């Protein structure tokens, strides 16, 4: 599958097949509303990018990742509620779309956590995430390369849209980025990375044309 | 071009120039989070459709509209907070997208109210309104005609997007309607009405492309 370059209001967006961990430069990884780091059968799934990052791709150790999040200078505006009775995992919730920068990784609070489904969003929350994320990346990383996977196409359950396709999520990513970037003179330089294992599942012809 | 029919995932959506008040059938009108009805220089503007509705197009009187809202069977999950201290206007807030049906009008809680800016939304709240509104309309008014104006293209200030174009809001309406309707076997039959005075600011051929998402 050949990379495609889209002209979106003067700005180039690239959609390519590959492996997010091989991208040079900033790489976005979806964490949850707690920035959880425990990978097991109850909290973060090793089948997710959040889990694969922790298991196989950290800058150093889990301890150092935990300390980085604990000591990170979050704005007070980014703190949401505190979940005092949570029996396992972290307790501070963060507002959807919040970033935590760690070397060449943009960690972001993407899904909300639920015991049974682990990763849930409503469709309005999915759109809120995207606008908040794109607005932050276009402010802080103007004119810089940022690579992202297709948000929401893993284990996340988007309420009432359980079988939304990867292609439809990619289209939502593209028009929400267009909305965000239209108010910035110099947006981020976005690349969306489709996992090579899923390339023939995604019909890119709608996107390309 | 004054009118186009779009095939959005198997369902016809019409976009046309016209006057919402002449539509036969259900007509959506954007009210605010309180369903306010006072039209003056402080609360609802007569320049808005909310105001033109109240001033010129009610089923009967303002008193009967107020009673209708007061006695309406809202569900518990549609209530937001109560603004005990508000000095003018209604005090019960409703969740964005809440509907109040009144004869052939779908009144909906669209913008949030600010003393100074009067009508405000963030862009996430605008998208949440649209998804919530289309989901409600597609559930309750499946296979029925529903006409809407271009939401947000009047006096509403969408934070950080003060000059977003009517065409871009129309495309957002179409993209979000497609997302909503893709989960319903029989969606509402949507018509979006562009005011005859603004049709030349919208290229309906550009608009056709949004049927693909
Ligand atoms: N190397 C690689 N290169 C490029 N693409 C890759 C890839 N490997 C996989 N893909 C694909 O990328 C897309 C996104 O995958 P993710 O797994 O990020 O799913 P997503 O639904 O966005 O988020 C999951 C949410 O669940 C939370 N959670 C809760 C419990 N455990 C996790 C998380 O904290 C998060 O919030 C999918 O298409 C994956 O195949
Ligand atoms: N006959 C007609 N046929 C068809 N199109 C017509 C039309 N006449 C006007 N148009 C156009 O329709 C679009 C939408 O117009 P609206 O005025 O509804 O603007 P909107 O920004 O969506 O909402 C305003 C929000 O401010 C709140 N508010 C606060 C104080 N006063 C009001 C309200 O409660 C609401 O929440 C614009 O393009 C109008 O030209």
Numbering used by the authors:
A (entry chain B): 65 to 273
B (entry chain A): 65 to 277
Q: How do the authors describe this structure?
A:
The Thoeris defense system triggers abortive infection (Abi) upon phage detection. The ThsB genes encode Toll/interleukin-1 receptor (TIR) domain–containing proteins responsible for phage detection, while the ThsA gene encodes an Abi-triggering effector protein. Collectively, our biochemical and structural data demonstrate that the nucleotide signaling requirements for ThsASIR2-SLOG and ThsATM-macro effectors are distinct and suggest that ThsATM-macro effectors can trigger Abi via membrane perturbation by a mechanism that involves nucleotide-induced oligomerization of its macro domain.
PcThsAMacro also exists as a u-shaped dimer, and the structure is very similar to EcThsAMacro, with an RMSD of 0.9 Å for 215 Cα atoms. Unexpectedly, in the final map, we observed unambiguous electron density for an adenine dinucleotide with the distal ribose linked to a five-membered ring in the ligand binding pocket. Liquid chromatography–mass spectrometry (LC-MS) revealed that the PcThsAMacro bound nucleotide has a mass corresponding to IAD. The imidazole base of IAD stacks against the side chains of I108 and I219 while forming a hydrogen bond with the backbone amide nitrogen of S109. Although both PcThsAMacro and EcThsAMacro were purified using the same method with imidazole-containing buffers, IAD only copurified with PcThsAMacro. We show that IAD is a considerably stronger (~30-fold) ThsAMacro ligand than ADPR. The ADPR/IAD binding sites are located at the dimer-dimer interfaces, but neither ADPR nor IAD is directly involved in subunit interactions.
